[PDB]
Amino acid sequence: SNDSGIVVYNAQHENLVKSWVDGFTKDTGIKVTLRNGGDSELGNQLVQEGSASPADVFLTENSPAMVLVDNAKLFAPLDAVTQAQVAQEYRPEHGRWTGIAARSTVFVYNPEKISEAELPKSIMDLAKPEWKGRWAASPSGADFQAIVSAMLELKGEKATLEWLKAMKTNFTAYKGNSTVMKAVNAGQIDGGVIYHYYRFVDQAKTGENSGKTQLHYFKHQDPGAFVSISGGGVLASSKHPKEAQEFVKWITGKSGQDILRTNNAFEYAVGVDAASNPKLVPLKDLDAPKVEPSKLNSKKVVELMTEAGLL
Ligand SMILES: [Fe+3]
Ligand SMILES: [Zn+2]
Ligand SMILES: [Zn+2]
Ligand SMILES: [Zn+2]
Ligand SMILES: [Zn+2]
Ligand SMILES: [Zn+2]
Numbered sequence: 001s002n003d004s005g006i007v008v009y010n011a012q013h014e015n016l017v018k019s020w021v022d023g024f025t026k027d028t029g030i031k032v033t034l035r036n037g038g039d040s041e042l043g044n045q046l047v048q049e050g051s052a053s054p055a056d057v058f059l060t061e062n063s064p065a066m067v068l069v070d071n072a073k074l075f076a077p078l079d080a081v082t083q084a085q086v087a088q089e090y091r092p093e094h095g096r097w098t099g100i101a102a103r104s105t106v107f108v109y110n111p112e113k114i115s116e117a118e119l120p121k122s123i124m125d126l127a128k129p130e131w132k133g134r135w136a137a138s139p140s141g142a143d144f145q146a147i148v149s150a151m152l153e154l155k156g157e158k159a160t161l162e163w164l165k166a167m168k169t170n171f172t173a174y175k176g177n178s179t180v181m182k183a184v185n186a187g188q189i190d191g192g193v194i195y196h197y198y199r200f201v202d203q204a205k206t207g208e209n210s211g212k213t214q215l216h217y218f219k220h221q222d223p224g225a226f227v228s229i230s231g232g233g234v235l236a237s238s239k240h241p242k243e244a245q246e247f248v249k250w251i252t253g254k255s256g257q258d259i260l261r262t263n264n265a266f267e268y269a270v271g272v273d274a275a276s277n278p279k280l281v282p283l284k285d286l287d288a289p290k291v292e293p294s295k296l297n298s299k300k301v302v303e304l305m306t307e308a309g310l311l
Contacts, residue, residue, distance in 0.1 A: 005031030006056040006240050006247060009046065011039040011142070012230055015201075016101070016265035017059065023259055024250050030243045039065035039142030040298065047072045051237045056244040059100065059232050059251075062146035063092070064298035066231035070095040075233040076241065082249045090229050090270035092294035097233035099293070100251055101260055102268040104286055105147050105226045107135075107216040108199065109191035110184050119216045123151070123193065123224025127166030136172045136180045136192035139310045142298075143177055143195055143228070148305065149296040150226035154289055157304070164308035173310075178202075178209065185212045195228065200266035200279060219287040227288040229270070 005025075010017050014036055021032045035055075037045070043065035046053055050072075058075075060066055069075060075096035082098060083091070090099030107119055114134075120126055126135055137144050152160045172189055174180045180192040181199060196217075202210035218224030232251060234244040250256050257271035268276045268283055276282065305311045 002029045002031065003240070005033065006243050007033045007035060007054050008057045008059060008247070009042045009055045010034045010036050011042045011058075011060045011065065012101070013061065013265060016263065016267060019259050019263040019265065020251050020256055023255060024247060027255065028246060028250065030246060032247070040145070043068045046074055046235070050074070053235060053237050055235050056238040056240050057232065057234055057247055059230070060142070061103075061230050062142050062228045063231055063293035064146055064149050064296045064301070065142060066092070066097045066233060067095065067294055067296055068298055069233065070097055074236055076236040076238065078234060079245045079249060082245070082252055085249070085252045085272060086270050087272050093292055094294045097231050098248065098252060099229040099270040100232040100248075101230040102270050102283065103195040103197055103228050103230070104217065104268070104281070104288070105224055105228070106194060106196045107191050107218065107224065108181050108184050108194050108213050109216055110187055110212055111214050112212060113187055114190040116216070119191065122220070122222045123218055124155075124163060124222075126170060126193075127163045132170045133172070134190040135170065136174055136183055136189045137194075138174055138177050138180055139305060140175060141177065144193065145298065145301050145305070146228045146296065147193065147226055148301045149298065150228075150289070150291045151223045152297060152301060152304070153291055153295050154223050161304050161307065164304055164310060168308050168310055181213060182209045185209055187212070191216075193224070196280070197266040201264065204264045204266070217281060217286060221287055221289040223289060225286055225288045226291060227268075227283065227286060229293050230267070
C-alpha cells in the first residue's frame, strides 16, 4: 500500500527535520529518505542533476538557495492547501516554493566581556575601526551568506561591499555558527553574528556551549534584524509527486508547525496563526526589516564576499 517513499534533499538542521519526519511517517505511512547537505551545495546539485535528480523535496535553512532552484525552473507548483497554510509574509512574491520556518539574526555576546550598552547599535557599526578584533562569524555558511543577501537587498551593492571589506579587516572566522557561539562562550571574542536558535538548542541540552552568552536583537528595521526564511519546494521531476506534496503540506500544516513550537530546534513557526516556542521573542516584536525573499541573490553575495577576500 505504501511504496518506498520520498527522497528529501535536506539542508535544514538535521534534528529539526528528524522531528518532522518522525511525526510525518507515523501519520501518513510515507517513508522519508534524507540526503543531508548545505543550502548552496544541495541547490547546485539539483541544478546540475536537473531532470535526472532522484529528489522529491528540497528543504533549506535560508531563502537564497530556493531562489536559485526556482530560477532553474525545477519546482512544481505547490498545492492550494499548502499555499493557504503559510502566512503571507513567509511566502515568496515570485517562485514555486514556500517558507517552512524562520530564524532571527542576532548578535551573540559574552556579558562577562561586554555589556549590553556596549553592543553595536546597528550591524553596519561592525565595520567601524573600534570593532576590529571584537567579532566573529562563519562566512562559508549559507546562514551568514543569507544575512549578507539581506544587506545587499536593503543597502545596495556599494554599501554592502564596503561593509564586507571592513569585515575582512575586523572579524575573526570560525567554521559553523555553533563554533562562533562556543568561541564567544569561552571568551575568545566579544561577540558574533549568528541566528537565534543556536543558543536555545544548546541550552536545552547541557548548556556547556552557551551558558556564558546572551543574545542581542538589533531591531530598528536594521539589516541586522533580518529574519531569514527557511524554504521547502517540491521538484517537478519527482516520480512521487503526491507524497512529495503531502510532505510539504504536512510540515507547513498544523502538525508540522505545532512541532516547531514544541520541539528542541527552537526555530519560528511561519504558519497562519501558528505561535512559536514561548521562550522565543515573538516575530512581531523583532522589528525586522521588510526583505522580499525572492529577491535574494546567492551568486552576487558569493561574488562580493570573494572580492572582499572572505571566501
Ligand atoms: Fe544554521
Ligand atoms: Zn556538505
Ligand atoms: Zn572586548
Ligand atoms: Zn540587547
Ligand atoms: Zn531606530
Ligand atoms: Zn511514491
